């Protein structure tokens, strides 16, 4: 009421209002005009607009008052694949449509079958090779299930056989800039040039991450009370990204080749509090993209960086891994 | 009619079950002799265990099939107590029957627990004379060895190329579709002995055609409906990694990954499968490539960021194939 | 919709296309016989001498079970400490004297502990005080019947109110008060409360752990000093009792096997007599191996440091593999019905569930909430276990690996930490807020920094003793 | 009609015919001859002859009173708290006259599946009625039975059957059944037996029914597991490409799961004798790492390929 | 009543160092209606937990610092005595996940369900880096579904092992270690509050460098120094260290001076002595490594090998059960490389 998260406040309520994705929106509006869709999948970058797309589809298919009744949202959550998902689906299938509203007559198709949304149900402790098969075969005319995933890594071909696979392409920079600037100007966010590109680079095209970062930056600017435009440094700090000057110092230290100097600099830098994973990622970005290094050097440093990142992801001590990685880079 | 082809083209008798031959010959020997022990079909899904056993049961049980068999499922909403009660009530009854030898159709035993399996084998012990059990599973390592020792263990292997091609030839004339040779080759390569997968791909391709009467189906249509990486794209990625510079190889890999939405894993096994056909001058190249790719896949399974893993894959492949050069 | 410029092309960077030779198999019996499993020297079954039965003893040709055959008749043989026996006998006789007078005295016990003779001692006391087997009458309450209020309330009141048809040495004895069923034993603690209010005969409750009995009952028992705690007996005394029992049977036995039996049976008198009853028949067969000996141990120094370094690396990889594989089973395991599952507790919370269904699935009343992970389950014995195989292979030629297998335990280093923390709490008290704050603090930094500094402070204050008092506890715990 | 399987047709009806664990079998025979049957919990791997042993013991103890002196509680019949509280108590309270030394028998096979509460109620009714009836447990895992039951029973840890007793019993069955045998076939049967005597009998019966003469290849044609000889050649090949070819064709394309391949490779490495003990331990460690990676979820062809690469490196170098 | 305890700040304005973070926390506490999920990361002993307690005190009131101890007992499938002392308050809750081990998914889920069953109740999670992947996924699922009564505030040493969605749905707050001038100021405040007779302020500076950016270690050093000399610190009083650090230094000296198998046996005995006194293996490996790196008679390649072996065996330790095997393996590897 008082506040709405901008990730869910500015969702596209209209299917045609969704930025880009013409090849998806045209086919889905044709499908809803056909008033029937099968159990179908999505695949694309996380936060590309899958949940927003299905919400717009069921908004233009069902009624606003029927939102909380016909739609029963079971994503990858406390719901367990064989424990409470199955019983909820069954008692919802026994449940019928409530009373129709005045605006849902002759405007929205409101078909008898329900729509059940499962977000990332593949990554669950229960393998559903045929869990929903009989409950969408016997209850085909009264319910329908839509599954949402990231990649095309289908585990079981049953339960995903009659699949209308539509692809969300990666969000281009222009439309992301336009939408995020529209959100900022609706929320009177004061920012100067070069910032929005920094958020989109940090989020790597994830608009939900970008929207949350923009909201956090606006909150920080308002809490500061200065009223000045948000700078990029606050955005980097809010995302854990190490500043570029420190990365320049790190690469200078590893180019120097002195062991004691590298150890001392690592010891001083672990008191700064910056995460080592961000350091490894920025080292990868600075090294692999650069064209001033030989093929053998990049071949060795890629494996070294991968090993260090894998060790860091295993919940190990960051100082020792970072020191080993910097020393190994120096020895290259 | 307007039904999925999975249940439409089930083998009505043992003669239409292709691919598997030794088990069917053993079944024919059993029926000719008259000995029907406890059976156990397991293997990859889609090999036709359920189809083979339903054909067996129907051709033995004629018209009172609908009464004197009972098809069970361990994964339904009944529970261990309810399945035990059902088995005891169906075995200890001796209803109105022409011939005995009650048959149990118990599917998906891989989810059965140790106590449930012990109860099942004890019921098998108690009611062997009147009831025969043909519990069905898929993985043999998820079943207690006490249950394996009381059933005639029959492993099921994926269907070979000739049987799949013969069934495609049978289907196309009935459904008045036609497939190009490259399309059939790609389909049987991606099938990996999964028959239901093949039928669903065929029905999806028929539904995809604007005029499903005389339109030809290509490799692109099957590869996009099934959701499998195209060999040409992976070959292009491999050649960009090998003969091109670091920046352009990374650009091509990222562009292909974004366009086709394939995971780094499936790319790794595709690269391994393509490189296995080719030969290498040195063996240390193959050793290092396999070890590094396995480590990369293992690290990807745990989690992390994809960019450094792609860079690691490219670097490992480059180092391996410059070791031999 | 779908557009791409990429076209089908052939890769030519590697070597030209490899010709694939088929690999036929023509195995011969000369290599088939190589499948003979090599004799595994890791297994070390050692034999012991056969027992020689001396004479023809009447006790040898008995019908009753040996723990019942060697049942104590007085208060000297029941294996329990003498102070506790004297205290409980004095309480019993005082209660019998007082309850004869028409009646502030509530006869009540919690005979908690980890000993074995928690029931026969009361019977021996009854034999001593009554002087005859038929004089006393004990209503021994077990877990084999229903301990529900509506099924036993009137019976227990009638037994504790009126006389017994035949000095009426009556007593009510409650075995297995640690185990309670939520619905089968519904209203049980109400039964104890009602009996304790309306009592004229002693009530004795025996258990394993004190926490099951409600706290008000603990307070009532402690007010009358009727809370008796029993402790397990050391291996020396029980070994002496077994030797006395065997020399009463006139059977010659070696001391090593008896020591091994006592060690492996956790010094349980019933278990030891049961094992000796099973394993001392008049037969020529050898005895059980008990503790396995050294399976051709070659625990050398490893000579060069390379060999020991490789062995240590192998041990580390073994530990990693075992930690990964000992809690991942492909076969799903059943969940015990008579166990306090949080889902089962939540189900019983709902009042829609009627009595008939409640009796169908009940649980043991416990103060511990039993959680479990369906995906993460222990390995079954028939499942593949590489970790165990490599561990038994390495321990067969290196004793220090076997030492490390039991030098540190999961229960250990945790009770030690608790003891160190309570000693630190006492020291910091000896100069509330710290009581809650240090427990709020992460235990890792407690292990790291605060404890050694507390030791430094304690030893500094002890040096000048020879700002805080009583520093020797921190010194001895850190020792 | 039906033919009686040799696992049940040649089941020993007496304790003397049961091989393996000679000390425990002899002690059980002495107990049956004299009397005063103790409470024991027979524990061990399945298929080693525990249920048959306890049934033969009950037979030899009672004789004609088998039907009314033994109450058998298996997983098929309900064994809840009400069962222990009512029918076991009534059977213990039943008045059955026996010759001196004998007692009523209460057998609870697969006792590892018992609920905790049923076991808790079981200890008191077995302690109080120990003068008239005796209990006998037979469970695969001894840790599933709570401590109070083990404190009132002499736990029997039946060991795995060796090769000599299984081989001699198979020779006896072959002699009494007129089966043509060969040494390699018997060795293959023992190799696939794993001490599982029921498995060995079933394999021999299936070999006789299907392929007639019992040869090693005939035995390995019905075991429906990865071939130990093919796996041995695949592990011991001097060329890595040959090993990859073998695992791709005869193992991966034939439907053999990764778990079965890993288990067979571990068994082959354990059976190895030509290579050094340290090299064998290194291969076993590598196979354990591969099993780790499969249990984590990565049961892919690439993991087996990498395992073969490192095994081949170990064989070629060092 | 320890000095580190009794001189812990209990209000937002009482915070001395990191003035920008203090102002940020004050402005977050200005509006009590919205508290986004916070993930405080940084070096140990820099005031992350103190800052969280100060923020909770400011947003709710004085009742936050009234902490109570509740003992919760759990049993897994292996029947192990899993005990967790959940620290509770009338306004928040504190949970330490690493005290349970692998079962940090089921225990956390049960605790969150129990708390949510009863405007919002804060749950404080210490050392969030120790959470397993399934536990982190369960926490992420709790964040979205239970975003009304439960607001997760996690304090961790390192934010690297956390999953990406948790980073996405949290306000990342970094707590850098204070500069040595700020540690000197805090120690001077303690001295002028408790009247420690200092001949010079250089002692506080030396303690600040010896604490290598850790406030609690510096405070404990001041405690031990003051209680050693009885409020009479001089310059000649040496910088003392905990006994385990000294034994580790002696172990590295023995390793670098002796080359024998019996030396490895003595090292195993010393590791047994260290572990038996309940010290975690990660910090033991850290101190042992960083004292082996400070040996003057070692060249660059040997030190690089030492750091590589330390990293590899840290990887093994983070995925292992018995720390003695991994530590002995690291000792053996550096032992063979030292030849
Ligand atoms: N085309 C779009 N136009 C405007 N906003 C968009 C668009 N696509 C996504 N968003 C925003 O991004 C948010 C999250 O993206 P979605 O993919 O719709 O949700 P999601 O599927 O839950 O994301 P993930 O995969 O769970 S991270 C939405 O709530 C919108 O606010
Ligand atoms: N050898 C075969 N010949 C002809 N059709 C086959 C064959 N194997 C499978 N099929 C068909 O493929 C589909 C698979 O059906 P099922 O036999 O029920 O699958 P399954 O092999 O039992 O595996 P699951 O996943 O455990 S049901 C059916 O439409 C069968 O008719
Ligand atoms: N010296 C002894 N003192 C006490 N009991 C003995 C002694 N020697 C043998 N026993 C047997 O030990 C058993 C102890 O009594 P039980 O009733 O079986 O156990 P309990 O006292 O109920 O305690 P539990 O079994 O731990 S619940 C009896 O069967 C006795 O016959
Ligand atoms: N040593 C043996 N000598 C003779 N027959 C044996 C031997 N061991 C097992 N058998 C036979 O092998 C089969 C195994 O049956 P059981 O004894 O019931 O198996 P088990 O050892 O009790 O383990 P289970 O039943 O899987 S829990 C029976 O036919 C036995 O007669
Ligand atoms: N702003 C501050 N001013 C003075 N002392 C502080 C400040 N922040 C933290 N401290 C000191 O830190 C100690 C607590 O550290 P803590 O927050 O537990 O570290 P961590 O967050 O690493 O667990 C307190 O005793 C307090 O004296
Ligand atoms: Mg989503
Ligand atoms: Mg089926
Ligand atoms: Mg059995």
Residue numbers in the entry:
A (entry chain D): 22 to 353
B (entry chain C): 11 to 335
C (entry chain A): 176 to 278, 329 to 391, 398 to 662, 699 to 733, 769 to 781
D (entry chain B): 6 to 323
E (entry chain E): 2 to 119, 134 to 354
What is the paper's account of this structure, in its own sentences?
By leveraging state-of-the-art cryo–electron microscopy (cryo-EM), we find that the architecture of Elg1-RFC is specifically suited to the unloading of PCNA. This report documents Elg1-RFC alone and Elg1-RFC bound to a closed PCNA clamp and to a cracked PCNA clamp at 3.2-, 3.3-, and 3.7-Å resolution, respectively. Because clamp unloading starts with PCNA encircling dsDNA, we propose that the three structures that we have determined represent (i) Elg1-RFC alone before it encounters a PCNA, (ii) Elg1-RFC that has taken the PCNA off DNA with the clamp being incompletely closed (i.e., cracked PCNA), and (iii) Elg1-RFC bound to the closed PCNA after PCNA is taken off DNA (Elg1-RFC–closed PCNA), respectively. The shared Elg1-RFC among the three structures is highly similar with a root mean square deviation between main chain Cα atoms in the range of 0.5 to 0.6 Å. In the cracked PCNA ring, PCNA protomers 2 and 3 are slightly uplifted toward the unloader, disrupting the β sheet interface between a PCNA interface. Clamp loader disruption of a PCNA interface is also observed in the RFC-CNA-DNA complexes, but, in those cases, the PCNA forms a wide-open ring, guided by the large RFC conformational changes, and is a presumed intermediate in clamp loading rather than unloading. Once the interface of PCNA is cracked, it likely dissociates from DNA (right). It is also possible that the Elg1-RFC AAA+ domains may interact more fully with a transient destabilized form of PCNA, leading to the cracked ring structure observed herein. Thus, after binding of Elg1-RFC to PCNA and PCNA ring cracking, the PCNA ring can only be unloaded from DNA and not loaded onto DNA.
